[PDB]
Symmetry: C4
Subunit: 298 residues, 4 copies
């Protein structure tokens, strides 16, 4: 019932922009490594049956496409060092940009050494902390979110790039304010409009992705932003970039192809990127950064 808000925007088509489709470059460095496109495979947990199966389809595809990939919560990896193989993905993705995952609420039960061990076990290149009071609140799970930001601030200068994200309910402007002084490497807005890790009566609460991207960019103008949350088409990707994002992330829609092998995942991402490439071209932008502003309301 709640959309991303991107349908309330129009890409500014430029018939006489004078570009050559081949001129558009999607190359975009992120978190230390250089990506072939401003795309990330969203974080996903799912089941322990298909777990390892899915991660390897995504990772392999990611490696082929030169795209980044966020792993699901390594939470269990701390307590169950045996579910290590379920995530170990470097075997099929040796050079890809991998981002470890963990709930920010875990900072009260895990210290620096645990964080280092997690990304080291996974051979990850960065760590993303997800914060989801709403989800954990509705699930009567762990609802104490006090001092987490201050707890991260203490730790923050870490040996690898660190980022923060929501899980489909979005980050508001005052949320970006709370992150303003932290030396983060990036932020994933993860707004409402697509799927909610919580859903998978109160699920009307949340911030539309389009809205989140605008609010967060205003507060953190210089930080690299990841637009995710129902940003399912290359066209929507371009809109997100024009509103202020730097990277796009897709999770849910990738489940289907992930169960049918890397070839299918790779194809999905491929349609999305080629579609993104046409949009930037039609927009007069020669790269993701140039898409900024080339969008209007109504």
């Amino acid at each position: 019932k709640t959309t991303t808000g991107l349908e309330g925007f129009r890409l500014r088509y430029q018939a006489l922009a004078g570009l050559a489709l081949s001129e558009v470059d999607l190359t975009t460095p992120f978190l230390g490594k250089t990506l072939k496109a401003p795309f990330l495979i969203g974080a996903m947990t799912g089941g322990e049956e298909n777990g390892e199966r899915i991660n390897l389809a995504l990772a392999e595809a990611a490696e082929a496409l030169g795209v980044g990939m966020m792993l699901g919560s390594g939470r269990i990896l701390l307590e169950r060092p045996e579910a290590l193989r379920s995530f170990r993905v470097r075997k099929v993705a040796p050079k890809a940009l991998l981002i470890a995952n963990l709930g920010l609420a875990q900072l009260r039960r895990y210290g620096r050494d645990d964080l280092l061990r997690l990304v080291e076990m996974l051979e990850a290149d960065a760590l993303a902390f997800h914060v989801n009071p709403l989800q954990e609140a509705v699930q009567r799970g762990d609802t104490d979110f006090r001092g987490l930001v201050e707890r991260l601030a203490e730790l923050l200068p870490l040996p690898f790039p660190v980022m923060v994200k929501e899980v489909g309910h979005g980050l508001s402007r005052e949320a970006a304010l709370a992150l303003r002084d932290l030396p983060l490497a990036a932020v994933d807005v993860a707004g409402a409009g697509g799927t909610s890790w919580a859903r998978v009566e109160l699920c009307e609460i949340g911030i539309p992705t389009a809205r989140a991207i605008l609010e967060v960019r205003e507060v953190l103008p210089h930080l690299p932003l990841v637009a995710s949350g129902g940003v399912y088409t290359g066209t929507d990707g371009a809109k997100a970039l024009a509103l202020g994002a730097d990277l796009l992330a897709v999770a849910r829609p990738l489940l289907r192809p992930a169960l049918e092998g890397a070839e299918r995942v790779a194809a999905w991402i491929g349609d999305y990127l080629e579609e993104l490439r046409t949009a930037l071209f039609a927009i007069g932008a020669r790269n993701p950064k140039e898409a900024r502003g080339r969008v209007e309301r109504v």
Copy 2:
């Protein structure tokens, strides 16, 4: 065809608000007694068959949940002192906050002693006068509403707290103006959007609850306000509170569970409050009062 208007508002979700769900306190003193939640069971008459049956289900639940309860018009109690047992509810609700009810149009046929007798017979803690020109007008009932406010003003300083309410068609800003100098204890906006005591072609007339809450708060900034009229979910409750209300009231939806015993009523209110609690938490509010303003348009 006419909504409360609350769908035109968005709760401002705060992922990084830094609260613990357990930190949100719903305790709110009202009309002399202290409630466990800012909730009231709306006034209802219905039939003489189920009459006593329903009141006792509501009252008992109210007592268990620490919530307030408005009784239906005690009109008949004045003329028929035998329908006394139909309302006598203290038997099952000894400490709850009970609010006697009576049409403001009755002030022309009843004096001070009658008002005192009514709340004393009911062992009520306050008296609420409902004013419904539209309803009585459409029902060709008693349509003379002259001098009622002046009549109440004369009486007003009474031995117990007194309030005024509509019945599903709402109170406008100029209505709040007419109540401005009266020493009332509270006001129930009772707007359009849910059910109309009148309905239960002209029923398009009326003021949307969301609209009424805004208008009345502007005129009576310091007075405690009750938002009612299709405020059926905890989410809608939070929106009402953020727009300016202090208490929520639900009537109609409570009929079903009231006919199936207190256990069912209590469960309904329970879902509503726990749902309200999540919303305040998701909003960054630690209590009803803090919800104020944490809502935006569109």
Copy 3:
């Protein structure tokens, strides 16, 4: 596909207005006689079979309700003095306010004496000229509308009150401008939203009644205005009055009851007026004139 626009307005319900339904007076003098309500039976031609039958049902009802009545084009009466009995209605409506009708385009084929003869034959109290370039244009009929206003200006000071009206496509503000210096007795806005005498691909052209009432009132603030064109309910009547009208007129919906006798017509008008009376009461207005402004957008 095009509405009156009145659905985009909300009557301002006044719970504490302090009126008595019996206090609202609909009496409104118009074109020389005093009406019991600000209502007129719209002009209608139809067929020559039911012609006389319908006029007598309307006229009789009009007489009973103290309402005005506009006759259909007396055009044929000029050329065919035998269709005199088809309109002769005084037999059943001796004191009612009757308004003769004639296309403004006829001023080029008829002079003063013809106009006097027409209203005298009909025993009418006034003459209304309808101007419908669109309708006659679509019907490839007589489309020369040059100098008609100047032609009426020359004649205008007539022995009886004269007015101008459209036929369901509305009068714009610049239209009111063209009528500004004429000594007219009243104007019927007759906008789009209900039925079009033309309809009974281009019928999207026209001005919504709500829109016409606003535009014309702005240009002719002091002149009495008749709101017509899909103003089918008492509620819509009140809205029209609050937007600036002084009288309401309904045509089409009256056909059905007119074929079933005066008793049915009279009943229809009766529901409409009693419904109008409730609305003014709910609005805080004690008469049609006081309804002005008691309406808001959205």
Copy 4:
């Protein structure tokens, strides 16, 4: 899913404008010849089977109605001088205004002499260059659009009038900017809302005709503009003219009648023009130029 935007506008009906339908003159000179109406038959290619068949139905009709006609891309005529008869239409349309067609992207493979030969072979009166990066991009065709405008600027002073057009995706204001200094004879906005030569997931990109007409007129106030792209009714034609256009063009809808002979095409255009004539009349405009501004929003 994307409309022209013309539905968001209302023609300003003028009941008292004082015109005679016969007073409205559609005569409008364009590209050197004088048209009986501000109408052009849009450019269409289609198939090689019906090719010649369709062109002759359109051309013949154009000749009868005194309207202009744009031919499909003469691209093939350059390489295949045998498909000359497929376009040769003067046989049935000796005096009509014919406009040769060619993709602007061809300027990199064709020089002045080739352009002269093309219009001379076709016995055309002007040349229209269509620019469609989006279409060619989605069709993985020729996507290099660099230096085309500068290439045309060099050539531009040609022996005949030259114009530029899109193909159903529209020209933006910055597009008009890129054409600002070129000595063009006219511009065809060809916006989104009707059909896209490309369509015949990314086809949401583009500029609504209504929007394009406004943007382009603002940048090129003095240049004659052609509104096309789902401008299928005379009413829509009038709206386009009131927004700023000078000529209307319809392509797709003309296919059906073109396959059933000139008589059918001629009839279609005939309904459209007579419908356009009524609209200007209803609007108070005595010709296409006077329609300007006689339209409002909402």
